[PDB]
Amino acid sequence: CTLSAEDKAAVERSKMIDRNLREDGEKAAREVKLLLLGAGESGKSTIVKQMKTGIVETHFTFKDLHFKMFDVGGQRSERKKWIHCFEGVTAIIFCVALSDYDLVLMNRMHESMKLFDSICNNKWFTDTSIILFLNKKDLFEEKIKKSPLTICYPEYAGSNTYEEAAAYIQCQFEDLNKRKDTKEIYTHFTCATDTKNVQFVFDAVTDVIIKNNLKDCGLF
Amino acid sequence: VQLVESGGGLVQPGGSRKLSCSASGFAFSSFGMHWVRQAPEKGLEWVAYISSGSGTIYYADTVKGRFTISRDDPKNTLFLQMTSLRSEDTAMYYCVRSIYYYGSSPFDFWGQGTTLTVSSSDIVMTQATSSVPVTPGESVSISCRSSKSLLHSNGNTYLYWFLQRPGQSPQLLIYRMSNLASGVPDRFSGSGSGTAFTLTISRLEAEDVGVYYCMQHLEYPLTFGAGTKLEL
Amino acid sequence: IPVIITAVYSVVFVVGLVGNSLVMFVIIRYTKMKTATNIYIFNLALADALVTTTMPFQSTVYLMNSWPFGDVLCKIVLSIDYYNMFTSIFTLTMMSVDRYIAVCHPVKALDFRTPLKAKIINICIWLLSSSVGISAIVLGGTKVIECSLQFWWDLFMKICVFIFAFVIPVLIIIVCYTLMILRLKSVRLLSGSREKDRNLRRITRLVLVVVAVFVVCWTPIHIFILVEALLSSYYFCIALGYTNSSLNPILYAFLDENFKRCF
Amino acid sequence: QARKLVEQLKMEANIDRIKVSKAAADLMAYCEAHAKEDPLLTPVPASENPFR
Amino acid sequence: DQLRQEAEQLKNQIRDARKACADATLSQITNNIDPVGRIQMRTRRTLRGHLAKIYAMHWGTDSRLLVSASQDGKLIIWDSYTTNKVHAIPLRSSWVMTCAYAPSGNYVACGGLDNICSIYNLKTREGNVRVSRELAGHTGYLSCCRFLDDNQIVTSSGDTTCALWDIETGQQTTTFTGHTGDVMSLSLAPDTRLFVSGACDASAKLWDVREGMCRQTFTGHESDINAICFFPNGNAFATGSDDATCRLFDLRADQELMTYSHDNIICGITSVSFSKSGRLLLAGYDDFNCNVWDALKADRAGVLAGHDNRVSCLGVTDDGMAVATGSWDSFLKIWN
Ligand SMILES: CN(C(=O)Cc1ccc(Cl)c(Cl)c1)[C@@H]1CCCC[C@H]1N1CCCC1
């Protein structure tokens, strides 16, 4: 074996470490990583609360699937220098408050729109699916009754009803998906008193997993 | 870190007994473990070895096929089952921890020892000196000879020095010639050239008086050396 | 006619050997052996290469109409032929089951479709085929001299081979692939716009091509075996089986998403 | 904020500097005086290579 | 108003002094000697076991053990000679972009998106590696960390700030605040009396550890500086930036001397390192391979091709025996 007893025992220790590392890395491959993004007033404290310094990590489970959410809103530094850490990620959960179409911090809805445009067309997320949440739909319904949507979009030219306005906002957000041939956007309307977003995230992640292992199997 | 041994006692010849050592104070699962025995009046003699995860089990040719070593990692315990106890198996047994990686210090901690009395290719390590008369404050050199060269291809010289004080378990001073252990005073020094080794003490107090043993870890069965008593 | 069929045999043997060797080289050098798909592809290619290696012996037997190799070579050749055929068929079935589990049960496939589990699956497949080969080598004697199994027992062996090499694997492959295609149809990303529909149709075309190749290249020889139990046609049918074994890697590599992306 | 930047700029300005030729010669001399002890510059024989 | 004009005048004065000090160019002086013919380093060792992108590696002072940080929350200590894992430390937060090896060898340090520098004691009375200190005083992500000694460590963060801590108490004894962009790299001097730090504002600031204030500022880049390294002499340093350019700044001359760039390379540089003599400048580019430049002639001496993704980290031994390159493909490679 051209090795000493001590060297052979060191090799054995390295093999045990290798076994533990393989077990750990196979345990981490069955977990779903979701990157949570949004604006300050977009609303993601409710989303984190419902489906349950430095960055925050949330762990939960749903239908024998383990989900990790990475809330990185606290990192008030250059996003270009730490976003590539999330390059390999199952999905991006993007929260937007659709009730702030008239709010001003520069409209808040516009700030969310440019943030979504920057994140969706990022070079590191050229194929990462996005789960779009539009929060505070009751507040938007109350607001649209009095104040028209034309405050944010002068070229709206549509009915001043909650359904049409919400559909227009969703279409405006989804139109930012440049090259919509490799990635999907799973838009969803939520509320504070509404527990169905976990199932929506689960379905989107299931579709993402099916696509991922279709690529893995070489069928695509 | 402590290793408390249990078992022993008076056993009729031809019987069987199980020695159990409980480890408390360190990460037991990451340490290989040894059973090393000492006759009631003679020096140390290695008995058994079990690796981390029980992936490697060795016995001495004096006991191979008759002894069985094992470890309970979740319960943090080491076992040695002894079957067909001869009359030459009466001794005090020490359980020793030893971890093997680069720069490690094996045989660092020794157990308290459990006694066991039964009613009535190897590398030979030679310690010619015996009952050396010494006085405090002087410098004493203890010599040692090996039947085979302990120096290896990688450059290590697997020569270990142990000090056994009267009424106490042996303790590690040098875990490879010229490698001083942890918690050992700087006076102790080790040197060697091939098969001849020397442990030097530039100044000695009354505490470092006892039997000095030499062990080889080049290849199994890990032959010890005869004692070198120091008299005050 | 004998010259044409012999040239066909040489062509299919050469093509199968070259394609199988290229497939193992690509799965070993061009890309890493990660994921279960690469391991399954490599094992199937190895089995098909074994079949292509034992084909020229059958070609020479047809050419000379006698067995000159003797019993010592006959035993090992027959055993390795059965071994290679069963390994290839079982590997194809296991790949079909792997794809079905990947698509229709994704949460379970997260903790099932690890490369290690693929290794144990392949080892079990090769061990079962080795058991079949041992059962053949026990009775694989020799007694114009024709090499065959020496022992109504031959009828039972033929029926067992037909049931365990054509019927069950074809049924499993068809069921798994049909369920997989239905689930893909139900998927939002696959059944979307024109490009997504085109991708779904391409996947369906690939699956149908695989199943049709297997069925159309394995049915006639088994039909001949069952009919004669209850000389040019026999060798043509066995050549069709050899063509199945040889061209399975060709379609598996040339019509692979990973291979197309790499090349 | 402006005062701190002005003070820092003033401190940086009142710094002694040497000619670029002198610093270039210093780097050149350092590179020449340690060329023998540089395994990456010229590969060592496999006998003395710990990685082989 | 008047303060801005005074600052502009001071900047013009500094530029004029630097221009006056530009007696010649290092390229002109180095044109009179033979360059390195062709550096050819093969992969002597390949360390595998990381199951994510490797973001930082650091050699030991004995230059046999090396620590490596990866995004699977793993800090692996490798025996480079025999390719075995001495230790595998699991990190509390898997988002780590830096790792350091103590010069004594008893400690390692790591940090990242948790804004904390964690110190792990390698040599315990037990058989494990445990975290000793959690230095948490930064407001941004930790980009680098370097042990001054067993009890002093300097960390640069993304809050445009460096700090010098006391590991015994955990309180940052000194704070270095002069940067406008996020600090991305660190490099201790050979005598460990002062250091350099490059930031996202295309500026490299040399700070003095003892006094605690910025000593010099260098500006020659166009984009963020992702990597900085100190020349073995200690009177120069090299910065690798996002415009596919390395720049050699001097200390006493206070101006850039050489610009390592090529029209064939348009990708950023993630790491830089120097040979023992300082003749070779090794830079880990984004084009999946490292480049070895003749630091005196700005000639690309060689390419360390062999990685299948971006080369994030890259180091050189203290005896100059080997060059370790980590990469996003989860494999470390020792070259010689
Ligand atoms: C024909 N056959 C044999 O095992 C007999 C036999 C073998 C070798 C030689 Cl050289 C000769 Cl003459 C005869 C098997 C079993 C029936 C169907 C498939 C056949 N093969 C299995 C893979 C492809 C061909």
Residue numbers in the entry:
A (entry chain A): 3 to 54, 182 to 234, 240 to 354
B (entry chain S): 2 to 121, 124 to 235
C (entry chain R): 58 to 200, 207 to 214, 221 to 299, 309 to 341
D (entry chain G): 11 to 62
E (entry chain B): 5 to 340
Structure paper excerpt:
The κ-opioid receptor (KOR) is a member of the G protein-coupled receptor (GPCR) family, modulating cellular responses through transducers such as G proteins and β-arrestins. Upon agonist binding, opioid receptors activate the Gi/o subtype of G protein family, initiating a cascade of intracellular signaling pathways. In this study, we present cryo-EM structures of the KOR-Gi signaling complexes bound with U-50,488H and nalfurafine. Overlaying the receptor regions of the nalfurafine- and U-50,488H-bound KOR-Gi complexes revealed a close alignment with a backbone root mean square deviation (RMSD) of 0.4 Å.
